């Protein structure tokens, strides 16, 4: 998280935390309640985001569900939905932590190798994450929507 990164930076050159690191930690903890409220809203309605994003992705890329596609089949579609659920949970984790370190550490480092093993088209990741971002930003207010969409943006860039 934010305090984790500050502590790592301070310990890297073997010193106590800089005043700037203390200010960034204060800024993090001061906005912790709003982050937890965003976590409320995203966690409660998870089904809406996941299903609407799946529908938007499948409409945008019909070849995925078409025969010969990676998502073709009921089990493969279920795996698609489970992957979207994983990424939504990680986005909520990063929202709470104040950094994208949970998203990265859990499901970004080595994501390309895994999806190469699965033949998963990374543009499919990008479009699914963009649909998730659209739904999440729609269900939130503007001040929250921008900050939340930043995390989806980072995830999409990591997949792309």
């Amino acid at each position: 998280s934010v305090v984790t990164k500050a502590i790592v930076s301070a310990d890297a050159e073997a010193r106590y935390l800089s005043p700037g690191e203390l200010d960034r930690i204060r800024g993090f903890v001061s906005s912790g309640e709003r982050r937890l409220r965003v976590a409320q809203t995203l966690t409660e309605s998870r089904e809406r985001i996941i299903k609407q994003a799946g529908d938007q992705l499948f409409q945008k890329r019909p070849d995925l569900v078409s025969p010969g596609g990676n998502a073709y089949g009921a089990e493969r579609t279920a795996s698609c939905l489970r992957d979207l659920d994983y990424y939504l949970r990680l986005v909520t984790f990063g929202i709470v932590a104040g950094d994208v370190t949970p998203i990265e550490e859990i499901g970004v480092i080595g994501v390309k190798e895994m999806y190469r093993n699965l033949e998963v088209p990374l543009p499919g990741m990008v479009e699914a994450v963009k649909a998730m971002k659209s739904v999440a930003t729609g269900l939130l207010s503007g001040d929250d929507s921008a900050e939340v969409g930043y995390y989806f943006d980072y995830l999409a860039g990591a997949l792309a």
């Binding site: 305090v3 984790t4 502590i7 073997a14 106590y16 935390l17 930690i25 204060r26 937890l36």
Partner: protein, 162 residues
């Protein structure tokens, strides 16, 4: 190496489930203690040199043989090594204070220190006494609320090296 937030993220991620309300309550706890933690951290950063001063002074006062010949602190090099160890312990205790978790202590302090001291022959009891000497004075400067909260990390270091 993880704080309270990343610790709860890990314990909820391993189960594969989303955050529950109890997780949010635990998170509100740390967010509510954050400003006190940062204030104590600033105080300790300001007073680290003085804390080392008085902690080394008290440790060498209660145990005189350490500085005297035949003691496990009797050398300029060995004296510097002891004070360096105490300074590192204080800094990592403050780190664990800010993070709210003792994982950093395991990953960056107790990682190989126990058997290093065992091979070197450093007495465990004297090290625990030095940890206590630092804790009971640092708690005086940081305030009672932050005193009780550094208590867990300092006696964690003591029990780990024990």
């Amino acid at each position: 190496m993880q704080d309270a937030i990343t610790s709860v993220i890990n314990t909820y991620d391993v189960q594969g489930k989303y955050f529950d309300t109890s997780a949010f309550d635990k998170l509100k706890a740390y967010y509510a203690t954050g400003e006190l933690r940062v204030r104590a951290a600033g105080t300790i950063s300001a007073n680290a040199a003085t804390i080392i001063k008085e902690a080394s002074a008290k440790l060498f006062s209660n145990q005189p043989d350490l500085v005297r010949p035949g003691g496990n602190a009797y050398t300029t090099r060995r004296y510097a090594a002891c004070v360096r160890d105490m300074d590192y312990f204080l800094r990592y205790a403050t780190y664990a204070m800010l993070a709210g978790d003792t994982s950093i202590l395991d990953e960056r302090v107790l990682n190989g220190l126990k058997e290093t001291y065992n091979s070197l022959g450093v007495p465990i009891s004297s090290t625990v006494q030095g940890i206590q000497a630092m804790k009971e004075v640092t708690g005086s400067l940081v305030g009672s609320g932050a005193a009780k909260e550094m208590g867990v990390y300092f006696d964690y270091l003591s029990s780990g090296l024990s």
